[PDB]
Amino acid sequence: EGVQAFIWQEFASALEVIPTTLAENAGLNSIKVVTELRSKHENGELND
Amino acid sequence: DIRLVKKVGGTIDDTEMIDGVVLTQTAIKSAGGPTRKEKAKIGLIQFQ
Amino acid sequence: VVYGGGAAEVTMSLAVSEEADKQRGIDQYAFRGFAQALDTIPMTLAENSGLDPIGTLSTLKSKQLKEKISNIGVDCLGYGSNDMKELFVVDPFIGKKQQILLATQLCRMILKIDNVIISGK
Amino acid sequence: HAASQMAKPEDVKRRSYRNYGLDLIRGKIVDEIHAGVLEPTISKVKSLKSALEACVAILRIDTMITVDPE
Amino acid sequence: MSQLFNNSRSDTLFLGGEKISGDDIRNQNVLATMAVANVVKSSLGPVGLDKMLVDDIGDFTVTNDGATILSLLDVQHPAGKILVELAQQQDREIGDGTTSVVIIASELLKRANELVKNKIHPTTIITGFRVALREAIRFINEVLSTSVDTLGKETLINIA
Amino acid sequence: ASALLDQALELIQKGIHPIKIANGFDEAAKLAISKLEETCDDISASNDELFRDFLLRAAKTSL
Amino acid sequence: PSNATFKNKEKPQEVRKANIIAARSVADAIRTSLGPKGMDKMI
Amino acid sequence: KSSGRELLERCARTAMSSKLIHNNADFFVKMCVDAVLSLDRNDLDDKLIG
Numbered sequence: 065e066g067v068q069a070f071i072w073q074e075f076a077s078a079l080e081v082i083p084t085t086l087a088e089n090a091g092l093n094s095i096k097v098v099t100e101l102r103s104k105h106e107n108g109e110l111n112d
Numbered sequence: 113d114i115r116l117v118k119k120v121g122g123t124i125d126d127t128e129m130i131d132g133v134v135l136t137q138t139a140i141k142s143a144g145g146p147t148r149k150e151k152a153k154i155g156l157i158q159f160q
Numbered sequence: 161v162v163y164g165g166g167a168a169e170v171t172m173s174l175a176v177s178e179e180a181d182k183q184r185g186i187d188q189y190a191f192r193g194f195a196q197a198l199d200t201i202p203m204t205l206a207e208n209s210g211l212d213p214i215g216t217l218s219t220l221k222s223k224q225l226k227e228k229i230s231n232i233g234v235d236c237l238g239y240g241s242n243d244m245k246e247l248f249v250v251d252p253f254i255g256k257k258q259q260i261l262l263a264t265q266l267c268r269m270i271l272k273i274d275n276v277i278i279s280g281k
Numbered sequence: 282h283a284a285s286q287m288a289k290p291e292d293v294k295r296r297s298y299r300n301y302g303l304d305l306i307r308g309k310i311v312d313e314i315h316a317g318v319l320e321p322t323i324s325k326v327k328s329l330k331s332a333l334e335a336c337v338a339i340l341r342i343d344t345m346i347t348v349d350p351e
Numbered sequence: 352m353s354q355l356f357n358n359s360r361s362d363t364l365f366l367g368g369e370k371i372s373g374d375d376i377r378n379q380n381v382l383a384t385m386a387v388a389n390v391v392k393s394s395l396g397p398v399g400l401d402k403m404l405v406d407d408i409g410d411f412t413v414t415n416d417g418a419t420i421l422s423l424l425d426v427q428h429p430a431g432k433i434l435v436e437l438a439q440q441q442d443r444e445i446g447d448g449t450t451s452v453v454i455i456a457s458e459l460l461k462r463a464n465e466l467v468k469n470k471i472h473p474t475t476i477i478t479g480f481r482v483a484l485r486e487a488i489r490f491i492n493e494v495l496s497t498s499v500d501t502l503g504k505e506t507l508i509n510i511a
Numbered sequence: 512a513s514a515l516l517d518q519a520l521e522l523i524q525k526g527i528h529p530i531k532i533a534n535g536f537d538e539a540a541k542l543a544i545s546k547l548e549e550t551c552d553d554i555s556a557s558n559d560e561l562f563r564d565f566l567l568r569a570a571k572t573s574l
Numbered sequence: 575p576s577n578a579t580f581k582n583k584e585k586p587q588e589v590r591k592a593n594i595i596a597a598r599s600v601a602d603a604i605r606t607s608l609g610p611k612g613m614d615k616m617i
Numbered sequence: 618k619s620s621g622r623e624l625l626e627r628c629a630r631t632a633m634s635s636k637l638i639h640n641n642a643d644f645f646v647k648m649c650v651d652a653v654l655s656l657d658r659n660d661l662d663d664k665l666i667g
């Protein structure tokens with residue numbers, strides 16, 4: 065907790081630019097691709 | 113230590129592995145010397 | 161009438177945020193963008209008044225979520241109390257409403273432009 | 282040509298069709314063997330491959346960048 | 352087909368010429384291909400007829416070959432230089448089909464650009480051509496014919 | 512208006528249609544003004560004396 | 575409040591904004607060249 | 618044997634797509650439907666809708 069919490073939060077948001085572009089270039093719905101990847105990773109899947 | 117020889121012409125499928133070293137230079141053929149010779153020992157002339 | 165000065169903005173920002181996770185769908189990011197867009201006004205008042213936007217924004221979000229009283233905003237003149245009952249500040253409802261209506265209705269037109277032809281004079 | 286490809290293996294006449302086609306002088310369908318129209322197999326081999334790589338080189342281009350000369 | 356030239360952009364400052372993107376590039380590349388494909392389209396086959404090109408000194412060259420007519424046509428566009436050098440690669444290797452290989456490539460870029468406008472990716476389009484060409488060469492092997500029961504040099508005469 | 516455009520850009524980049532973005536603000540704007548109307552206080556019940564003072568509270572704001 | 579530090583300078587944050595937009599402009603030029611679905615760039 | 622008032626509202630809803638109105642069409646479609654119904658059916662004029 066502190067002033068650096070938002071900086072680390074935006075650091076995590078900017079790190080996901082790679083898979084957002086793969087869904088964009090492949091014509092897939094990106095927002096959907098990144099909402100399912102959170103769901104699969106929370107179930108213990110390290111690689112998805 | 114890796115060598116890539118650039119050449120115009122041919123197709124992409126023509127690229128293949130060569131077990132030995134390949135010379136990018138060509139023969140002179142001014143006096144009409146041979147172009148093919150078997151069981152030859154290659155000597156490196158470092159003088160003129 | 162209403163009570164502006166960052167109190168109406170943070171009150172209207174958390175109202176759409178509390179409904180965003182209830183109505184996830186696909187437009188939840190638009191609700192969050194509308195929430196963060198309303199927060200720029202009290203952060204601008206905090207920026208011009210010199211106060212910290214972190215402590216100011218965190219205090220309004222944490223306090224307004226706890227207490228239901230919705231007349232606390234950004235004190236720019238540097239008073240010790242942020243309650244606007246004592247500071248003598250009042251705004252009209254028709255005035256604060258038109259800020260959102262004319263803004264959200266214009267930006268629909270701004271976003272719908274694809275071809276942009278400008279004839280040089 | 283279609284009536285030839287679909288056909289039974291055992292059908293001489295139809296199979297022959299696989300062999301002939303367009304004529305530019307008289308304007309009718311005649312046999313290439315009697316007419317004498319013939320090409321090598323090597324002429325078609327590596328011709329579509331060169332056209333394929335030619336299509337791949339331009340088709341994969343999205344944006345164009347031009348630098349003016351100094 | 353492209354009109355209303357792209358605006359000079361202030362947010363993206365690159366030295367030299369201006370950058371342009373979108374579907375106008377593949378439209379301009381196909382338009383550059385039709386500039387050379389229509390030249391060689393008329394001089395195909397026995398019924399085809401050729402044209403003349405002057406050398407700006409009184410001399411000229413009446414050319415039937417695709418490599419020669421494109422060699423004198425110095426194409427300033429980048430996409431056209433690929434087909435110009437392809438014909439110089441074609442005539443040196445095989446010496447045949449120089450007009451057809453340019454016409455095949457022009458028709459491919461026509462329909463490939465139409466397929467990109469139909470919202471399928473070029474990577475799937477290229478994969479469709481490669482699996483199709485691999486079956487085409489397999490089909491070319493099926494329709495071969497060995498010269499047999501021919502009197503003398505007749506097979507070499509009529510093929511010439 | 513610029514704040515809505517700045518937040519809408521991030522979104523366009525992540526990947527959403529622009530008219531669908533404006534549809535989200537419309538449902539959010541009507542819900543925002545509807546919630547402000549719920550927590551709105553009326554000063555018409557007071558007499559003219561207290562209502563005289565309320566004009567000073569708003570006139571001093573804009574001035 | 576009135577005792578807060580104004581810092582006297584808005585030119586630094588404006589120059590940083592001009593650099594970020596200039597850096598994001600060329601970064602968005604090559605965004606579509608990533609992955610198997612990327613496209614070539616002839617210069 | 619449906620009602621005549623709902624016919625104009627049903628067909629005018631298609632016209633308000635691809636515009637800035639499509640979300641505010643619940644309120645403005647009643648305006649144009651009630652506006653044109655005031656006109657005479659025999660003599661429908663285009664200059665009276667300025």
Ligand SMILES: Nc1ncnc2c1ncn2[C@@H]1O[C@H](COP(=O)(O)OP(=O)(O)O)[C@@H](O)[C@H]1O
Pocket residue numbers: 164165166234235236237247249251572573
């Ligand atoms: N003394 C004050 N205390 C708290 N908030 C204030 C005070 N004065 C102004 N404000 C807030 O700052 C805002 C400034 O609005 P103003 O700049 O006067 O209108 P405009 O932006 O159209 O020029 C008001 O909406 C009000 O909520």
Ligand SMILES: Nc1ncnc2c1ncn2[C@@H]1O[C@H](COP(=O)(O)OP(=O)(O)O)[C@@H](O)[C@H]1O
Pocket residue numbers: 303304305318394395396397415416417446447448449450451
């Ligand atoms: N006498 C003929 N009858 C039918 N087709 C012919 C005849 N001569 C040429 N063609 C066809 O014309 C095409 C192009 O021939 P030609 O112009 O000689 O080669 P290039 O395309 O290299 O200039 C060939 O694919 C061939 O099938």
Ligand SMILES: [Mg+2]
Pocket residue numbers: 447448449
């Ligand atoms: Mg020929």
Ligand SMILES: [Mg+2]
Pocket residue numbers: 573
């Ligand atoms: Mg004012």
